[PDB]
Amino acid sequence: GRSLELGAADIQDLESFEAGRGALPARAYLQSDAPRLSLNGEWQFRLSPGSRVAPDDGWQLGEALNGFESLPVPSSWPMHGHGAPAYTNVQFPFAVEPPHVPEANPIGDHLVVFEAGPEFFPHALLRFDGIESAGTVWLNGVELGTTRGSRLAHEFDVSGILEQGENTLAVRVAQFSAASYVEDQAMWWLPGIFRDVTLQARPAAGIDDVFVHAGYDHITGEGILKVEASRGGQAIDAVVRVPELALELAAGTEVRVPAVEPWSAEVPKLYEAAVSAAGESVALQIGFRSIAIEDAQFKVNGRRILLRGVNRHEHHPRLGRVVPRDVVEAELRLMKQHNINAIRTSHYPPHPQFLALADQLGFYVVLECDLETHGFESAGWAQNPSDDPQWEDALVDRMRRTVERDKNHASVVMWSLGNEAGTGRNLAAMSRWTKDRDPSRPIHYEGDWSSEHVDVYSRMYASQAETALIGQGIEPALNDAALDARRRAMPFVLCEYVHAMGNGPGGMSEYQALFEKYPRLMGGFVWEWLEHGITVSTADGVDHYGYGGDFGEEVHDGNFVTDGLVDADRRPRPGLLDFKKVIEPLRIDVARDWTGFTLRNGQDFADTSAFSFRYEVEADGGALDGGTVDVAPVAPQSETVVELPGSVAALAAGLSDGRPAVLTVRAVLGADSAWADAGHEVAWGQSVREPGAPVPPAPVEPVQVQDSELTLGPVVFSRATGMPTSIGGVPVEKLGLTLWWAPTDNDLGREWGGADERPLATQWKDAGLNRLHTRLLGISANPGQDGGETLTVRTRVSAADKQYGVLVDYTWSTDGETVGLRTQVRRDGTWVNRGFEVEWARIGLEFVLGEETELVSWFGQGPHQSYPDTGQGARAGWFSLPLAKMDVEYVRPQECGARSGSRSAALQLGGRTLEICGDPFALTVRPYSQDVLDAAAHRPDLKADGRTYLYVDHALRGVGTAACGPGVLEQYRLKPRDADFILTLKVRS
Amino acid sequence: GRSLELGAADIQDLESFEAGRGALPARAYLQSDAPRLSLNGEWQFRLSPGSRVAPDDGWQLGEALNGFESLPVPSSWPMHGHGAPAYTNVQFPFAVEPPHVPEANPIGDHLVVFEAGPEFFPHALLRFDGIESAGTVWLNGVELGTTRGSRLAHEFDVSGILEQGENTLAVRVAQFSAASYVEDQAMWWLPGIFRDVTLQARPAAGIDDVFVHAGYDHITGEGILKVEASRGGQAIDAVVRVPELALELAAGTEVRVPAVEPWSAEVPKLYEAAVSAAGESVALQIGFRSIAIEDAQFKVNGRRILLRGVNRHEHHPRLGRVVPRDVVEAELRLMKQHNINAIRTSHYPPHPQFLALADQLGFYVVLECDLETHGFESAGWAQNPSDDPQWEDALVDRMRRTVERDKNHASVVMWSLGNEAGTGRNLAAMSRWTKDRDPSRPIHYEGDWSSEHVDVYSRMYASQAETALIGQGIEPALNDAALDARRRAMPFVLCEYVHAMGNGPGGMSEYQALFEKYPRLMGGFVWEWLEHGITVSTADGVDHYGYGGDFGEEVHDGNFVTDGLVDADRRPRPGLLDFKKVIEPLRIDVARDWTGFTLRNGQDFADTSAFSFRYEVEADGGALDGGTVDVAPVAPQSETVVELPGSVAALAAGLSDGRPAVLTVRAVLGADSAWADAGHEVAWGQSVREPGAPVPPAPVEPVQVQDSELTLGPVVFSRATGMPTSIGGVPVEKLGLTLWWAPTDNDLGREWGGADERPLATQWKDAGLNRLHTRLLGISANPGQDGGETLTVRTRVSAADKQYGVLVDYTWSTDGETVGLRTQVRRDGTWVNRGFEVEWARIGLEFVLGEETELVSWFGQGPHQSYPDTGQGARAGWFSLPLAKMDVEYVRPQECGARSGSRSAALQLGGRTLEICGDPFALTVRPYSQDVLDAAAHRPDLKADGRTYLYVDHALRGVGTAACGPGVLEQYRLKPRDADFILTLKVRS
Numbered sequence A, B: 001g002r003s004l005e006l007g008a009a010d011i012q013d014l015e016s017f018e019a020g021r022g023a024l025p026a027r028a029y030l031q032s033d034a035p036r037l038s039l040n041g042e043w044q045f046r047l048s049p050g051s052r053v054a055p056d057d058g059w060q061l062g063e064a065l066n067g068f069e070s071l072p073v074p075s076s077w078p079m080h081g082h083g084a085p086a087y088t089n090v091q092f093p094f095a096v097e098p099p100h101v102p103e104a105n106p107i108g109d110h111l112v113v114f115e116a117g118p119e120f121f122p123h124a125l126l127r128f129d130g131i132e133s134a135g136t137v138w139l140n141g142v143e144l145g146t147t148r149g150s151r152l153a154h155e156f157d158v159s160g161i162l163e164q165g166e167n168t169l170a171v172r173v174a175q176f177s178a179a180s181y182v183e184d185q186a187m188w189w190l191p192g193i194f195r196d197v198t199l200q201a202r203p204a205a206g207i208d209d210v211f212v213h214a215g216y217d218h219i220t221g222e223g224i225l226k227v228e229a230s231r232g233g234q235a236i237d238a239v240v241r242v243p244e245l246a247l248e249l250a251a252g253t254e255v256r257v258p259a260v261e262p263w264s265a266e267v268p269k270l271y272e273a274a275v276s277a278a279g280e281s282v283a284l285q286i287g288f289r290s291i292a293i294e295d296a297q298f299k300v301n302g303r304r305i306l307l308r309g310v311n312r313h314e315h316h317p318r319l320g321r322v323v324p325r326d327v328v329e330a331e332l333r334l335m336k337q338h339n340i341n342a343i344r345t346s347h348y349p350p351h352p353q354f355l356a357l358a359d360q361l362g363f364y365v366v367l368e369c370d371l372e373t374h375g376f377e378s379a380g381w382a383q384n385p386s387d388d389p390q391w392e393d394a395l396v397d398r399m400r401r402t403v404e405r406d407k408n409h410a411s412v413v414m415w416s417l418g419n420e421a422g423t424g425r426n427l428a429a430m431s432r433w434t435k436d437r438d439p440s441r442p443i444h445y446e447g448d449w450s451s452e453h454v455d456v457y458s459r460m461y462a463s464q465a466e467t468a469l470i471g472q473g474i475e476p477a478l479n480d481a482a483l484d485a486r487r488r489a490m491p492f493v494l495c496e497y498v499h500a501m502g503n504g505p506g507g508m509s510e511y512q513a514l515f516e517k518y519p520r521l522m523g524g525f526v527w528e529w530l531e532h533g534i535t536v537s538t539a540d541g542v543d544h545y546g547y548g549g550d551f552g553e554e555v556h557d558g559n560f561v562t563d564g565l566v567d568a569d570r571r572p573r574p575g576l577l578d579f580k581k582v583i584e585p586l587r588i589d590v591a592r593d594w595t596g597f598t599l600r601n602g603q604d605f606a607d608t609s610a611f612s613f614r615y616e617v618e619a620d621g622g623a624l625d626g627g628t629v630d631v632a633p634v635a636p637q638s639e640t641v642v643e644l645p646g647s648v649a650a651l652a653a654g655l656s657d658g659r660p661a662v663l664t665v666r667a668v669l670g671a672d673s674a675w676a677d678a679g680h681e682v683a684w685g686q687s688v689r690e691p692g693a694p695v696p697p698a699p700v701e702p703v704q705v706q707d708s709e710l711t712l713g714p715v716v717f718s719r720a721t722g723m724p725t726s727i728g729g730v731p732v733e734k735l736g737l738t739l740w741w742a743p744t745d746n747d748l749g750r751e752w753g754g755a756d757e758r759p760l761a762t763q764w765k766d767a768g769l770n771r772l773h774t775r776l777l778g779i780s781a782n783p784g785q786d787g788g789e790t791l792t793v794r795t796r797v798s799a800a801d802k803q804y805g806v807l808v809d810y811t812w813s814t815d816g817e818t819v820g821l822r823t824q825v826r827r828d829g830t831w832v833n834r835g836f837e838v839e840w841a842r843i844g845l846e847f848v849l850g851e852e853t854e855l856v857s858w859f860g861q862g863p864h865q866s867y868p869d870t871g872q873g874a875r876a877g878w879f880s881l882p883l884a885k886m887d888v889e890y891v892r893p894q895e896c897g898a899r900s901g902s903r904s905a906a907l908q909l910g911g912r913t914l915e916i917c918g919d920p921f922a923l924t925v926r927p928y929s930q931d932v933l934d935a936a937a938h939r940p941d942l943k944a945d946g947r948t949y950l951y952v953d954h955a956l957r958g959v960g961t962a963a964c965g966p967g968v969l970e971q972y973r974l975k976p977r978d979a980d981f982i983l984t985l986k987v988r989s
């Protein structure tokens, strides 16, 4: 018959296998003295739900617009009430049938009016630095072309189309296209023109592209300089000036500079330079460095380097994929302030402005092409575009635009073909193209474990164990002897590791020890830098972050989008505090006798001259001694023993026995830097003079007996339950054993290996650990001292429908001033459920106090939380915080806020102070219960109930990274066992 | 030191392994002419949360009661705002550590005042017919004893304690005791004095116990009568009178009555009798029947019987375990009215009054002892009381009281030791005791598959397949040759089968065919008769049933308590309608030529004389012919061919071709009976003259084209979606393919076998079947007839993140009056997800109409729902119901209401009528969407939205019984396939 469907031509274009049409050749992002007009500002915007109902009403001419409204550009339009964000991890949000697109496909018509002065004639262009995902461009009604590659730049020649005076730019943006099948990053799906739109004049005799080659000969100190310049793709005459180095040379020739200060993340030396032609000049920052793989090590400027990296997505909790420049500068400074030295642009090229900042502040950058076909894995990679020859030109284009834009920046030390895109012919073509075009940077790609087309062996979330076998070069061989030989000669990098989702990450230290031990290990990049939380303001409410599912998604992946070291507003999570410590570039081992400290320079190039070394002895009531010690500069990878002043050692020696004292040695910045002010802490070490164990009280007060109550000094017990009802007047609503905590995100992760594939959280629910019950066995008052008496309360703890349990005996003693509490724990029966051993989250006590706590003070590790396999950033000392500040504002509330390694603690309830002491314990204080915490999906769900939930733990479980990667390591797991521990309690005024 | 805990003595008694103390010997429940005073009425009640805080304030004396309030007795106290019900299936609600009890243990102090006249002196007793679970009894302050066995009777001698005039009865009831470990029935946990409390005078020279022995010699017709009578446990002189049989004999002698009419469930002949002594006389109903196992068949009165049974719990949606007598009489009549002939008192003895009703109405009863230790299975039966010698006396006591109470009733044909209590020495002791005491009734117990201590082989939920191997005597052998030999000589019964939870049960017919084919198969008892729904009235609302979890339970099992053939108010579920048909005692096969019908008498004893056989020919507009045919009585298990009047056959022959007509032959009661009025339908059969397929309309109307709309006769299409937007003025908001339905309770059940252990509902969610999306491929108007045109709309249906899909092509045609719709379905790709083939719930269409439907009429199967493996009770005919009555009020809303086998349908939306015809299809109409249905946990969650959701299915899946037992049988499963089907639509006035 004949087709009657609508929009078939618009759809046919969206389903195209090809790159965008009509665009100028890909080139570098260059600072040019050519006239430019940024068209950023308030545009006009119309949204349609699909191509078949996108109007063809001549809107491109900007005349008589109906349905258009104001919208900022650049922008991610769902961040402005036009639709909503949608998060999927691996899942595609549309049926998988490439190259077809769903009928529900938001279409965004953009339009802006602007004026073009005579300086933009006769030749100019329009530059688009990012359009997600498919754009069509008209200028004054004539089509310029289309864009493919959402995070890549497109330029369109407007000569003869741009008219002097007023002009109308019209861009139609479709959210979904065939390109969506290759942009499946675990991300918020956010359409829009989300990066700059610029009008640029192109004068005659100008410069289109530049290719800086700045090598370094580390033997001679020579810099190897060659700056190419082209116009229309052809080499052209141009002069290269580098004033600081007394250099005038022509573009296209290679010279040897006798002496250059090499560039590195530690010392990011940049020489200002200009390459100029008659009609145009462009400014450049040149960093001399050479990259090479040698003896299975990734070496820069002749030395193996250690990558202390993070995975950086581009996200802003209000603007989506638009990251304001001042937030970029801030977050990169925050990285430096936490000893980070490397960045992977997961999983697409960043904003062009990012590259210069990385050059200046100092980061080894893995710049990654915009490619990910993850969602094809669930079907065994059938139809994977990475191996579909029809996608070759589209994927080579993505790699070309990636490389051409940023090829001049010294901070880029690796090109990455993409992420989690399988294996395929098109990936090899992208590698073949990159190796030919820019052989000065090694190629990275984790998705092909055989590593056939790369120069480094990359993996994500490989266990500490496998990492140690790789570091020794004894990993299992590949079937192909030749490929195995190639890969074994490669250095190894973890492009993603220690997944930082929620409470965690655990096991960072074990990775780091391997990084330091095995040169083949290049280091790793944490997943990930930031949480992609989106700010939602509650009706009649405060703000909170929303994640997957909180925006009406039919298909989503929950809070896996919030899996970062900082929150969306760049506030650190405890994991960043620990990370900073783990990757600290210096090691300070303070001598036990306080006579000195061993200092190892862990940096790769710089000495210790930039650091001032300070010490302080702190005690119960403030600092006792402190100052600065001068340290002869220590070479990279060298060690020395630094003497401390005799007054410090003499102080420790003369310290009365049992008095706590902490010696802390810090390496701070001796002077301001581009990323921190002087005195910023870089590394630290400590030696602690522990306090003696608290003497148990003498049991001189006897037990006392009423019909329904018992009294033993300051403690009142309920004769029915045997549990205290008050201590020093503080009401005790409950006291019992704890074996469970509100599951972390990691506990909700499935722990692979072994026949048990339930997450730990599910193992606990099945075992009934969240619903413990206690039965009283007996109460007995026993003879103490000088007529006094101890009180022993025997109980058994278990759960409904379970035969296993634990016998808990509480022995109380008092001298009227302080209470002595001995808890003894003993296993009864075999702790097996559903064929698998039950594991405990902890061995502790929960005190529920009938009054609110305003302040928590303790001596131990702090100020932030610490768990068995975390808390590296928690140092020994005295701390004190308001109850609200003890918590951690994770987006999905979960177990957090424990303070491991506490020797003493003090809770201030109103006018009174409850003091806990005894053998080391973990401390947690909350204004709500564990069941409220576990039930809470968002922070607003946390409601204080006027009580205080005090948790004192004799043993804790680790937190691991089971949400993605290794679970809790063996040494940190907690199997049911017998245990016993003492405490001493006291209430004042 | 010394114990300081409270309540230790009260707890020590609750933890006792022994039976109740101080009670009189167990005996029969006897109707006696001795004076009696029922103490039922308004008592005074105080509730304490545990033994340690249960006051010892002399309350037993009834003087100066504080904290007491009014409470009815008998009662289940949580049904009156004192605590709340709690439902667990297998789980114990308390830690499993027998014989210990939790600290949270409601204690119910009961107290009543009453007057004792001179007739209760010098000797009387107090009778308690049920106390859950542990009772202590005081009369005027002196302790009588304690009760153990919650559903068993206890009697306490009050001679010398009962004082003439006013007396005070005091009973302390603890919910939980050591006896809870053996009362783990899948049930609402409901403490209280829930059965009668009676004061009985015991005159001298009276009668304490009686043991009727009424056998039947089926060869001679002789009745074998021996009535024992005892006092204080000793045989006594007494006279036995049976007037109808002209009998005077002494108690203790066995006589041979020359001729008796034997007792059976079909013919429950009962002879009134009295056994009397000087001081007392007791009235008895005697039914002569003998029970024997012979040739591996369970025979009564010389013939193998077929059990058409149900499992009867005792529950009332407002009174808990208290079942008012008028509800007992009603529900038992309802059973008879649905061809049921057997009852298992799952899993405890019923109220004593139940036994006489079973004798009179006619049920083969399996009377089950109060014993279940199910909750010990999860620990491998460790500590199972059934094998703990310390529990022997307690369990033998339970069996003794069970047997002694009901040993006189002819309806009891089996003693059952308990339910799901494992194997053990104490079960053997209970069997040894019963076999000695009453050898006239075989012993039943499913929990020991070896069947070492039973006389019948019993299983629950054995598949149809295994049942067929057992019926043939070829099941796998037991390791012990001797035990195997014993069990192979046993008949086989299904004490529980075709789990009737929610939509279902499917597969009933396949079981029944085996019951009829293999004599060794005794039949089966459906699980279960009733749902244990509890009525909750919403604040400012209507009532609805609550189930597990709806009462604050920490540990519960959800709606598994609502798994019955009738709801808690005894309203039938569709499953009972199908069950009645499946077990109908006669088979009527109507001849195709309407000349007659084959009649098989499926009863075991009775002929067909009690039934009148009626026929009716019904057509489009009412009945055309009908009457009664006289049938010579047909013997049990015999057949005959019954001629119909020639007018019926002549009517079919002269019927115009294509006209529908239905001949129905019914067997109704010729006269009133004790359980139904005359004309009650017992069995039926049918022969249908099918209507010819509807001629497709001639495609003479052409297609019409506007910018955004298409019109083809009465249909308007959206040119963008290709889907109709209106038909005859009726708005069509959506039209699409369906492959999914809101999971039934069975679909939420895990289907064992094969590597896929996900419930079908989970297989569907993972596959995305609930979230289908459609993409338009093209629209094409093609040449029809005489200038007209057909319209073909090509689509593809799939789900996000999936590569498999289905191509759906809609071809429309019209002649202006009726619309022709041809749907073609074709698989695209392999329908595999997570390594397992995806199965479909259906192949159909969902019409969403923008107006409400008030009436649904159809020709097909009805009036109630029918699915591929159900609907046996749905007969062919013409039906018409209001939209609300098309639904099924399952407690947890779920898929239901489909009408399979529909030839035509008519929806009345306001003033207009939408007519659907075509090849047979399934019909469903709802005022809400599937997603609302699936999300609804309770019926109030179902909100009408002003639309009509019309479902027309070409193929449906079965419903099975996967919630517990077999899933959907192979012949009823629905695997992805190609399919095509036609429909014709029409709208009038």
Ligand SMILES: OC[C@H]1O[C@@](CO)(O[C@H]2O[C@H](CO)[C@@H](O)[C@H](O)[C@H]2O)[C@@H](O)[C@@H]1O
Binding pocket: A033, A034, A035, A203, A277, A278, A279, A280, A281
């Ligand atoms: O170094 C040249 C100097 O001139 C500026 C400002 O006038 O740019 C001009 O010079 C260009 C050639 O370099 C001409 O195209 C044109 O006259 C104008 O752009 C600066 O950009 C630059 O510092």
Ligand SMILES: OC[C@H]1O[C@@](CO)(O[C@H]2O[C@H](CO)[C@@H](O)[C@H](O)[C@H]2O)[C@@H](O)[C@@H]1O
Binding pocket: B033, B034, B035, B203, B277, B278, B279, B280, B281
């Ligand atoms: O058959 C006796 C007749 O008497 C009643 C009513 O008076 O009961 C009485 O007779 C009993 C002996 O059967 C005596 O214990 C006493 O006189 C009194 O219970 C009826 O029960 C019965 O029909």
Ligand code: NA
Binding pocket: A460, A461, A462, A496, A497, A498, A499, A961, A965, A966
């Ligand atoms: Na890792």
Ligand code: NA
Binding pocket: B460, B461, B462, B496, B497, B498, B499, B961, B965, B966
């Ligand atoms: Na069954």
